[PDB]
Ligand binder design. Structure first.
Ligand SMILES: C[C@H](O)[C@H](O)[C@H]1CNc2nc(N)[nH]c(=O)c2N1
Ligand SMILES: C[C@H](O)[C@H](O)[C@H]1CNc2nc(N)[nH]c(=O)c2N1
Ligand SMILES: [Fe+2]
Ligand SMILES: [Fe+2]
Lengths: 370, 370
């Protein structure tokens, strides 16, 4: 494969520079890296590799990857190639991938517009093969810059994999029979459609409300608050799927089931030994819905109440009431009120200043190995 | 097996009460549980079961499991049976195990004495079969009481299993050849002895110093501080193994290798997505040793320097200098100085107020699946 030879050349350069991350912005290093890319028989002739070499060679006077980002944002082709520094995606250094785009619903893309690219990875260098790397954000390039119109990529093939490995067996073990009928036996293309709706609604709603990100990002990185923000936007997305009549009814109900099953099950067991940010918020959701009549526990399995849409609306309204006071109080005062809400419905240890998995999901982690 | 019939009855009672944790101190519940234990054909005959029945029936007036713990602490036999509520061992409710004790060196047990019981589990009920449950502490019983002379149990078979499954693989993948020569190819009986030394020294040193636990426990539960306290005691234990000439030379060197390999490798990769308390402190140690000449990295392989004992002594001296100021400053002021030290050598995210695996161990987690 010509692409196979390109990626082989990238993986060898990646191996050569693995011990050199502290030099990734040093011009002596970048000049040498650029030359090695330029001289790579297959990689060096790719248009996107011409762009990266240009950006790297100019980095001492312009610390941006403007030519690379212009190629990517204009979708000149379906190749992504760059030098990365993303602390939460540590496997990424010099990396290359090819992707394929997915069908898009016109109303969804118009009404809930964002620069989001749900794609499948077709081929990729080693860094992009890590299970951790489920997306690619503009600030992940070494220049660390993001613009509101930069494209953001989500690797839907990885979310399909995670759904089939974790969520499906949790649905079987944890939900009352008939809870997610459209998901039952659904093929990978159906899960792919649902997941692509999820990411599109997710990115759109992050930018909405009284404390949108990135504006208030630095107030929403604390574990409980990062999770609660994730949950704000995904509950918004579930409600859009339930309420917006211009979305196709079959696809919308499927996306609803996908987002709800993921937030009620897969995200709820994330993290060992303590829950991660997603799981704290999913456990808040679980306990909130339990105590407010949205779900019921019978024989250890979750029944979705017919009233759930009303309770989800109550929940999102509650979060929005807390955030609305940003107009009369400080960001820090709002944070304390979001933490107080979170802690009412989660297992917070005040001496460790951290959370424990609630017993319901601790038992499921032990039973299912999730 | 007569013990298999006992455990089967316990496991059946455990299933019956799994939904009732909120009732575990309700006297109506306890009366019923006690009656069911008393009436168990095999279980109910056991001296320790009669002790628990008596404790449970008296709980409304004396919320203590005094009879059970007197049986256990006196080693009246080698059975442990109680009703547990340990937030970090969530699998434990009504549980039963039989154990066998392990050899101990006489000088070690006299000079570093503590109420510690390194044991192998012979048989156990389901709660104790969780890989999470590596030890049993007196406050893990429902009464929540610990006294300084209560026996503390460590399940050495589980530590042997973890050393075989994780540490051995990391030694081969990460360490320069000859790094841990006594541990290489060592059999389970040998790792058992080393791990037994580790736990005895660990418990002993937790009670030593200017900020021992449990006295200062509530200041040492924050993730970095909990890890640093683990590391303080295990570095103390390494140094005893190197320095105390009344310990047998071969066994002491083996224990040194065990404690060092565990803290340098296995504990360093603990926690997903973020390091847990152990891993934060182990990454502190890694970077401190790297920066101060105790270890060297060559193409991603760790060499242990001949000077490492002197650098370990410097590291422990530094912790003790920070803690000594408890005598002239508040425990909060000491906490802040222990955090400052930790953060110099770890990857602290100031906006998340939490830690990331340092790149060296993030890569090993990816490479080895640990
Ligand atoms: C809310 C929480 O911090 C979460 O990790 C955020 C972080 N920043 C983000 N930024 C963008 N563009 N899209 C996202 O989905 C998120 N997720
Ligand atoms: C120091 C840190 O909190 C660590 O987890 C402590 C906690 N309390 C403990 N208590 C006892 N008896 N033994 C131990 O090893 C520990 N570990
Ligand atoms: Fe998000
Ligand atoms: Fe400890």
């Amino acid at each position: 494969s010509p692409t196979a030879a390109v990626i082989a050349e990238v993986d060898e350069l990646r191996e050569k520079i693995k011990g050199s991350r502290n030099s990734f912005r040093d011009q002596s290093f970048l000049d040498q890296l650029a030359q090695h890319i330029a001289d790579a028989p297959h990689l060096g002739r790719q248009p996107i590799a011409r762009a990266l070499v240009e950006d790297l060679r100019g980095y001492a006077s312009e610390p941006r990857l403007a030519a690379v980002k212009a190629h990517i944002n204009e979708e000149r082709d379906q190749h992504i190639f760059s030098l990365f520094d993303a602390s939460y995606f540590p496997s990424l250094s010099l990396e290359y991938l090819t992707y394929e785009t997915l069908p898009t619903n016109p109303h969804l893309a118009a009404r809930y517009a964002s620069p989001t690219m749900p794609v499948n990875i077709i081929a990729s260098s080693k860094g992009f093969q890590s299970r951790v790397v489920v997306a690619l954000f503009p600030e992940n390039h070494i220049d660390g810059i993001q613009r509101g119109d930069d494209l953001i990529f989500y690797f839907i093939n990885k979310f399909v994999e995670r759904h089939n490995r974790i969520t499906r067996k949790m649905i079987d073990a944890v939900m009352a029979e008939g809870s997610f009928p459209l998901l039952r036996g659904a093929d990978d293309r159906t899960v792919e459609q649902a997941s692509s709706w999820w990411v599109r609604l997710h990115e759109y709603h992050h930018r909405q409300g009284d404390m949108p990100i990135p504006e208030f990002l630095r107030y929403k990185k604390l574990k409980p608050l990062a999770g609660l923000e994730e949950l704000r936007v995904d509950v918004s997305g579930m409600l859009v799927c339930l309420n917006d009549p211009e979305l196709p009814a079959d696809e919308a109900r499927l996306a609803y089931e996908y987002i709800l099953s993921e937030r009620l099950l897969r995200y709820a067991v994330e993290g060992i030994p303590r829950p991660n940010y997603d799981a704290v918020a999913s456990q808040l959701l679980f306990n909130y819905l339990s105590e407010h009549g949205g779900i019921e526990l019978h024989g250890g399995v979750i029944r979705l109440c017919p009233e759930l849409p009303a309770v989800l609306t109550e929940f999102l309204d509650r979060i929005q009431r807390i955030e609305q006071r940003i107009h009369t109080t400080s960001a820090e005062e709002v944070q304390q009120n979001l933490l107080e809400f979170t802690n009412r419905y989660t297992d917070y240890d005040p001496d460790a200043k951290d959370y424990r998995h609630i017993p319901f999901f601790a038992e499921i982690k032990e039973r299912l190995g999730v």
